Amino acid sequence: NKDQIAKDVKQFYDQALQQAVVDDDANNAKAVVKTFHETLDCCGSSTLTALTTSVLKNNLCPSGSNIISNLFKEDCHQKIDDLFSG
Amino acid sequence: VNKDQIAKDVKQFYDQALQQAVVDDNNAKAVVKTFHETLDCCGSSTLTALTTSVLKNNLCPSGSNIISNLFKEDCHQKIDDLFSGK
């Protein structure tokens, strides 16, 4: 089921992001998050965490990304929805 | 939540979308095309592009010849890479 898998992937991402920003330990989290961000061209679960993440933990955001554009760009949840919806 | 399970689920979802996409001929096509564009791949295996109607129907990323696909990673690998952090 599309919806369930989308939910699961978004949840997985959320976990990875929480770990990534909160604790430098759990080292895979950063990699997972950075690849999710690079793959989907986003920087957060929301524009708030995208904004919060683009600043202060920029090392895991895409290169071409203005902080103010992160405020307008789609979050990763939206991009995941887009991924699974087509 | 579990990385392996979700990866399995996403790969399965993709497989379904791909089967529908190629065996038909329409939202399957969109899902598959976006998966392919997002992950830069064209099949569940290196063989699909070779045996299925993916290449025509314009379902592959730009400039993706049959040759290249045989030496590029399939979508399953890219999904694994996505969820593993590679």
Side-chain angles (χ1 to χ4, degrees), chain B residues 13-33:
Chain B
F13 177 90
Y14 171 77
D15 291 339
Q16 296 167 213
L18 181 58
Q19 183 180 32
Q20 286 176 322
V22 306
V23 174
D24 200 347
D25 185 81
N26 260 267
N27 183 259
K29 286 178 228 150
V31 176
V32 167
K33 193 167 180 174

PDB file of all heavy atoms in Angstrom, chain B residues 13-33:
ATOM      1  N   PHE B  13       7.179  -2.015  -3.668  1.00  0.00           N
ATOM      2  CA  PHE B  13       6.341  -0.979  -4.263  1.00  0.00           C
ATOM      3  C   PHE B  13       6.843  -0.599  -5.654  1.00  0.00           C
ATOM      4  O   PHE B  13       6.069  -0.530  -6.625  1.00  0.00           O
ATOM      5  CB  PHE B  13       6.309   0.253  -3.354  1.00  0.00           C
ATOM      6  CG  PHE B  13       5.532   1.405  -3.917  1.00  0.00           C
ATOM      7  CD1 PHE B  13       4.177   1.533  -3.664  1.00  0.00           C
ATOM      8  CD2 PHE B  13       6.158   2.366  -4.693  1.00  0.00           C
ATOM      9  CE1 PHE B  13       3.459   2.598  -4.179  1.00  0.00           C
ATOM     10  CE2 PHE B  13       5.447   3.435  -5.211  1.00  0.00           C
ATOM     11  CZ  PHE B  13       4.097   3.550  -4.956  1.00  0.00           C
ATOM     12  N   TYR B  14       8.145  -0.347  -5.742  1.00  0.00           N
ATOM     13  CA  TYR B  14       8.758  -0.025  -7.019  1.00  0.00           C
ATOM     14  C   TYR B  14       8.531  -1.151  -8.024  1.00  0.00           C
ATOM     15  O   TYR B  14       8.118  -0.899  -9.155  1.00  0.00           O
ATOM     16  CB  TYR B  14      10.255   0.232  -6.864  1.00  0.00           C
ATOM     17  CG  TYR B  14      10.948   0.349  -8.198  1.00  0.00           C
ATOM     18  CD1 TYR B  14      10.851   1.512  -8.953  1.00  0.00           C
ATOM     19  CD2 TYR B  14      11.677  -0.708  -8.717  1.00  0.00           C
ATOM     20  CE1 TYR B  14      11.472   1.618 -10.185  1.00  0.00           C
ATOM     21  CE2 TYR B  14      12.299  -0.610  -9.944  1.00  0.00           C
ATOM     22  CZ  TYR B  14      12.194   0.553 -10.673  1.00  0.00           C
ATOM     23  OH  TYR B  14      12.815   0.647 -11.898  1.00  0.00           O
ATOM     24  N   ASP B  15       8.806  -2.387  -7.610  1.00  0.00           N
ATOM     25  CA  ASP B  15       8.624  -3.546  -8.484  1.00  0.00           C
ATOM     26  C   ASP B  15       7.221  -3.570  -9.060  1.00  0.00           C
ATOM     27  O   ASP B  15       7.041  -3.757 -10.267  1.00  0.00           O
ATOM     28  CB  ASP B  15       8.887  -4.855  -7.736  1.00  0.00           C
ATOM     29  CG  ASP B  15      10.346  -5.043  -7.376  1.00  0.00           C
ATOM     30  OD1 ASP B  15      11.205  -4.396  -8.011  1.00  0.00           O
ATOM     31  OD2 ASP B  15      10.634  -5.839  -6.454  1.00  0.00           O
ATOM     32  N   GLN B  16       6.230  -3.390  -8.192  1.00  0.00           N
ATOM     33  CA  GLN B  16       4.837  -3.343  -8.634  1.00  0.00           C
ATOM     34  C   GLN B  16       4.624  -2.239  -9.667  1.00  0.00           C
ATOM     35  O   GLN B  16       4.090  -2.479 -10.761  1.00  0.00           O
ATOM     36  CB  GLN B  16       3.907  -3.128  -7.444  1.00  0.00           C
ATOM     37  CG  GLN B  16       3.920  -4.269  -6.435  1.00  0.00           C
ATOM     38  CD  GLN B  16       3.234  -3.914  -5.127  1.00  0.00           C
ATOM     39  OE1 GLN B  16       3.633  -4.384  -4.059  1.00  0.00           O
ATOM     40  NE2 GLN B  16       2.193  -3.087  -5.203  1.00  0.00           N
ATOM     41  N   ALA B  17       5.052  -1.031  -9.314  1.00  0.00           N
ATOM     42  CA  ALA B  17       4.924   0.112 -10.208  1.00  0.00           C
ATOM     43  C   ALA B  17       5.583  -0.161 -11.561  1.00  0.00           C
ATOM     44  O   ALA B  17       5.035   0.193 -12.602  1.00  0.00           O
ATOM     45  CB  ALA B  17       5.524   1.356  -9.562  1.00  0.00           C
ATOM     46  N   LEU B  18       6.748  -0.804 -11.540  1.00  0.00           N
ATOM     47  CA  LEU B  18       7.488  -1.109 -12.767  1.00  0.00           C
ATOM     48  C   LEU B  18       6.751  -2.139 -13.622  1.00  0.00           C
ATOM     49  O   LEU B  18       6.589  -1.955 -14.834  1.00  0.00           O
ATOM     50  CB  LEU B  18       8.893  -1.620 -12.439  1.00  0.00           C
ATOM     51  CG  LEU B  18       9.782  -1.946 -13.643  1.00  0.00           C
ATOM     52  CD1 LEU B  18       9.969  -0.727 -14.547  1.00  0.00           C
ATOM     53  CD2 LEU B  18      11.128  -2.479 -13.181  1.00  0.00           C
ATOM     54  N   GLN B  19       6.321  -3.222 -12.984  1.00  0.00           N
ATOM     55  CA  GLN B  19       5.535  -4.247 -13.652  1.00  0.00           C
ATOM     56  C   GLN B  19       4.330  -3.629 -14.361  1.00  0.00           C
ATOM     57  O   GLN B  19       4.138  -3.819 -15.568  1.00  0.00           O
ATOM     58  CB  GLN B  19       5.072  -5.300 -12.646  1.00  0.00           C
ATOM     59  CG  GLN B  19       4.312  -6.454 -13.279  1.00  0.00           C
ATOM     60  CD  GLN B  19       3.857  -7.476 -12.257  1.00  0.00           C
ATOM     61  OE1 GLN B  19       3.562  -7.133 -11.109  1.00  0.00           O
ATOM     62  NE2 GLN B  19       3.803  -8.742 -12.668  1.00  0.00           N
ATOM     63  N   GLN B  20       3.530  -2.882 -13.606  1.00  0.00           N
ATOM     64  CA  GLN B  20       2.383  -2.180 -14.176  1.00  0.00           C
ATOM     65  C   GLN B  20       2.804  -1.255 -15.318  1.00  0.00           C
ATOM     66  O   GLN B  20       2.199  -1.259 -16.388  1.00  0.00           O
ATOM     67  CB  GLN B  20       1.664  -1.371 -13.094  1.00  0.00           C
ATOM     68  CG  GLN B  20       0.835  -2.211 -12.129  1.00  0.00           C
ATOM     69  CD  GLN B  20       0.224  -1.386 -11.004  1.00  0.00           C
ATOM     70  OE1 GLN B  20       0.850  -0.460 -10.484  1.00  0.00           O
ATOM     71  NE2 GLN B  20      -1.012  -1.718 -10.629  1.00  0.00           N
ATOM     72  N   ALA B  21       3.842  -0.461 -15.072  1.00  0.00           N
ATOM     73  CA  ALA B  21       4.333   0.512 -16.044  1.00  0.00           C
ATOM     74  C   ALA B  21       4.685  -0.122 -17.386  1.00  0.00           C
ATOM     75  O   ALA B  21       4.237   0.352 -18.432  1.00  0.00           O
ATOM     76  CB  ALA B  21       5.546   1.237 -15.487  1.00  0.00           C
ATOM     77  N   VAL B  22       5.495  -1.181 -17.360  1.00  0.00           N
ATOM     78  CA  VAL B  22       5.960  -1.799 -18.604  1.00  0.00           C
ATOM     79  C   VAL B  22       4.910  -2.702 -19.234  1.00  0.00           C
ATOM     80  O   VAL B  22       4.751  -2.698 -20.453  1.00  0.00           O
ATOM     81  CB  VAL B  22       7.259  -2.626 -18.396  1.00  0.00           C
ATOM     82  CG1 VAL B  22       8.331  -1.775 -17.756  1.00  0.00           C
ATOM     83  CG2 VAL B  22       7.018  -3.884 -17.556  1.00  0.00           C
ATOM     84  N   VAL B  23       4.192  -3.467 -18.417  1.00  0.00           N
ATOM     85  CA  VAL B  23       3.246  -4.439 -18.959  1.00  0.00           C
ATOM     86  C   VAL B  23       2.036  -3.723 -19.565  1.00  0.00           C
ATOM     87  O   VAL B  23       1.498  -4.173 -20.573  1.00  0.00           O
ATOM     88  CB  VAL B  23       2.813  -5.464 -17.881  1.00  0.00           C
ATOM     89  CG1 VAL B  23       1.723  -6.396 -18.405  1.00  0.00           C
ATOM     90  CG2 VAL B  23       4.017  -6.285 -17.441  1.00  0.00           C
ATOM     91  N   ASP B  24       1.650  -2.579 -19.002  1.00  0.00           N
ATOM     92  CA  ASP B  24       0.634  -1.741 -19.635  1.00  0.00           C
ATOM     93  C   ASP B  24       1.180  -1.194 -20.951  1.00  0.00           C
ATOM     94  O   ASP B  24       2.365  -1.347 -21.248  1.00  0.00           O
ATOM     95  CB  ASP B  24       0.200  -0.581 -18.724  1.00  0.00           C
ATOM     96  CG  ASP B  24      -1.159   0.009 -19.125  1.00  0.00           C
ATOM     97  OD1 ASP B  24      -1.657  -0.293 -20.235  1.00  0.00           O
ATOM     98  OD2 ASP B  24      -1.739   0.768 -18.317  1.00  0.00           O
ATOM     99  N   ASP B  25       0.302  -0.569 -21.734  1.00  0.00           N
ATOM    100  CA  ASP B  25       0.668   0.029 -23.017  1.00  0.00           C
ATOM    101  C   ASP B  25       1.083  -1.046 -24.019  1.00  0.00           C
ATOM    102  O   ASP B  25       0.367  -2.028 -24.222  1.00  0.00           O
ATOM    103  CB  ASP B  25       1.795   1.058 -22.831  1.00  0.00           C
ATOM    104  CG  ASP B  25       2.125   1.805 -24.109  1.00  0.00           C
ATOM    105  OD1 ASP B  25       1.399   2.771 -24.439  1.00  0.00           O
ATOM    106  OD2 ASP B  25       3.115   1.429 -24.776  1.00  0.00           O
ATOM    107  N   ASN B  26      -0.964   3.880 -15.796  1.00  0.00           N
ATOM    108  CA  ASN B  26      -0.604   5.202 -16.290  1.00  0.00           C
ATOM    109  C   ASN B  26      -0.170   6.148 -15.192  1.00  0.00           C
ATOM    110  O   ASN B  26       0.450   7.172 -15.470  1.00  0.00           O
ATOM    111  CB  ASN B  26      -1.765   5.829 -17.044  1.00  0.00           C
ATOM    112  CG  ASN B  26      -1.606   5.701 -18.545  1.00  0.00           C
ATOM    113  OD1 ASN B  26      -1.081   6.603 -19.199  1.00  0.00           O
ATOM    114  ND2 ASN B  26      -1.999   4.551 -19.093  1.00  0.00           N
ATOM    115  N   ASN B  27      -0.509   5.817 -13.951  1.00  0.00           N
ATOM    116  CA  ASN B  27       0.083   6.505 -12.819  1.00  0.00           C
ATOM    117  C   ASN B  27       1.320   5.738 -12.377  1.00  0.00           C
ATOM    118  O   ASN B  27       2.280   6.324 -11.884  1.00  0.00           O
ATOM    119  CB  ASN B  27      -0.907   6.648 -11.668  1.00  0.00           C
ATOM    120  CG  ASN B  27      -0.321   7.429 -10.497  1.00  0.00           C
ATOM    121  OD1 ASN B  27       0.112   6.853  -9.494  1.00  0.00           O
ATOM    122  ND2 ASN B  27      -0.272   8.751 -10.639  1.00  0.00           N
ATOM    123  N   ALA B  28       1.266   4.419 -12.547  1.00  0.00           N
ATOM    124  CA  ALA B  28       2.440   3.559 -12.487  1.00  0.00           C
ATOM    125  C   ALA B  28       3.603   4.163 -13.270  1.00  0.00           C
ATOM    126  O   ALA B  28       4.731   4.224 -12.768  1.00  0.00           O
ATOM    127  CB  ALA B  28       2.102   2.181 -13.021  1.00  0.00           C
ATOM    128  N   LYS B  29       3.339   4.616 -14.492  1.00  0.00           N
ATOM    129  CA  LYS B  29       4.376   5.267 -15.284  1.00  0.00           C
ATOM    130  C   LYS B  29       4.988   6.466 -14.578  1.00  0.00           C
ATOM    131  O   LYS B  29       6.210   6.624 -14.570  1.00  0.00           O
ATOM    132  CB  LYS B  29       3.825   5.725 -16.619  1.00  0.00           C
ATOM    133  CG  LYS B  29       3.591   4.619 -17.553  1.00  0.00           C
ATOM    134  CD  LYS B  29       3.013   5.183 -18.817  1.00  0.00           C
ATOM    135  CE  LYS B  29       1.858   4.377 -19.157  1.00  0.00           C
ATOM    136  NZ  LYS B  29       0.762   4.863 -19.834  1.00  0.00           N
ATOM    137  N   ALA B  30       4.134   7.303 -13.989  1.00  0.00           N
ATOM    138  CA  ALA B  30       4.591   8.490 -13.267  1.00  0.00           C
ATOM    139  C   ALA B  30       5.466   8.102 -12.072  1.00  0.00           C
ATOM    140  O   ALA B  30       6.573   8.622 -11.909  1.00  0.00           O
ATOM    141  CB  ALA B  30       3.410   9.318 -12.804  1.00  0.00           C
ATOM    142  N   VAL B  31       4.966   7.185 -11.245  1.00  0.00           N
ATOM    143  CA  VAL B  31       5.716   6.682 -10.093  1.00  0.00           C
ATOM    144  C   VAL B  31       7.078   6.140 -10.527  1.00  0.00           C
ATOM    145  O   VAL B  31       8.108   6.493  -9.949  1.00  0.00           O
ATOM    146  CB  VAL B  31       4.936   5.567  -9.352  1.00  0.00           C
ATOM    147  CG1 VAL B  31       5.761   4.982  -8.205  1.00  0.00           C
ATOM    148  CG2 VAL B  31       3.617   6.099  -8.826  1.00  0.00           C
ATOM    149  N   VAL B  32       7.076   5.285 -11.545  1.00  0.00           N
ATOM    150  CA  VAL B  32       8.303   4.681 -12.049  1.00  0.00           C
ATOM    151  C   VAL B  32       9.246   5.740 -12.600  1.00  0.00           C
ATOM    152  O   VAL B  32      10.445   5.708 -12.325  1.00  0.00           O
ATOM    153  CB  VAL B  32       8.004   3.633 -13.148  1.00  0.00           C
ATOM    154  CG1 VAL B  32       9.264   3.217 -13.897  1.00  0.00           C
ATOM    155  CG2 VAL B  32       7.337   2.411 -12.547  1.00  0.00           C
ATOM    156  N   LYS B  33       8.717   6.675 -13.380  1.00  0.00           N
ATOM    157  CA  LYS B  33       9.563   7.686 -13.995  1.00  0.00           C
ATOM    158  C   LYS B  33      10.193   8.555 -12.913  1.00  0.00           C
ATOM    159  O   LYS B  33      11.378   8.897 -12.998  1.00  0.00           O
ATOM    160  CB  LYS B  33       8.777   8.544 -14.980  1.00  0.00           C
ATOM    161  CG  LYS B  33       9.658   9.401 -15.876  1.00  0.00           C
ATOM    162  CD  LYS B  33       8.853   9.983 -17.027  1.00  0.00           C
ATOM    163  CE  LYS B  33       9.700  10.847 -17.957  1.00  0.00           C
ATOM    164  NZ  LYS B  33       8.921  11.296 -19.162  1.00  0.00           N
TER     165      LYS B  33
END
